[PDB]
Amino acid sequence: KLHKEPATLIKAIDGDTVKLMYKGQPMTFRLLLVDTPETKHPKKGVEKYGPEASAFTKKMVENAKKIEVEFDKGQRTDKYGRGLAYIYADGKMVNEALVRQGLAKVAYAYAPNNTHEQHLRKSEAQAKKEKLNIWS
Template sequence: MLGACSQQTENHTNQTALPKGLVSGTVVKNVDGDTVHVSINGKEEDIRLLLIDTPETHKPGTPVQPYGPEASNYAEKELAVGTKVMVEEGVKGHERDKYGRLLAYIYLPNGKMYNEEVVKKGLARVAYIYEPNTKHLSDLKEDENYAKSHKLGIWSIPGYVTDRGYDISKSSKSSSNTVSKHTSTGVQYSSNNTSKNTSSDGKENNTSCKGKIKGNANSKIYHVPGGEYYNLNMKHIVWFCSESDAQKAGYRKSQR
């Protein structure tokens, strides 16, 4: 169990002294935006980040939710495998959830708390608030208010964020321009997650290469067969026969 002493900040964007009693660890696996595996003292811990909830990307029976891929990509960037981090556990006796996962806050090499950063960027909501693990709740709520007031990420879709999670039906009511403006993956989301293209998916171009490299004309991102987002519904599809063709056309490869 780790100590609970911390110092508050006047401005969360500035690096401050870390709380006492943290333990060092190394990231060994990314699961999604709010779950990560960290090796601590030679033991791999499945860590569920405290007080945050990112949209789903891997939950069985649940379609990929808007900004879930962005949250996962952000985690892969900031908590890349091999990254040295500092871990602050939950309160003793309440440091694990019913699945046995370690509940914790994670601090990045720059001293910033990852839990706060992902909320501040509009890629997570503050959630799963259970005493006594509420130590950093006020800071996280402040970060959430910032993201909400600036309509960042999940807050850019009216009605999408609810007290119970995310209402994917709201995202289908947003214009494609709004969605494509804010996504970094090039994925257009649908509440019906299938691999088939319908007439509502928009016009497809260069269909002679269909089934090979799948590009999104709005985001200029392409997806390869076997990629995590290749079979998701998209609008404004442009097909390429090779990755080099896509790159020559100004497209970049999806991170997943």
């Protein structure tokens, strides 16, 4: 079973990346299962809807009174040392909120880190049907 743990916002970095205080140590978190247009993309820099996605994530975590991180079942850090998790702001999953708004696509999932994949894909299908942002 997945478990939610408390954390404290330090700084929102990009639409798919936020730095948090987790267990007394500052750490960069990469949002599991979602790909957002980037503003700090290593090859393109700023893509379309990139500023929109970053703003959405930033506002969501900054306005939250309780932030929680939920690791999946596989590895918990990627090769760059970023934690891999589902992030919740006052009980709402940021990863899902971005996909539901058409500000993120569901990324290629790798078991065992794919527990909420079907949930996310369902929100993505709804965002496509509504032709929101990325899907218009």
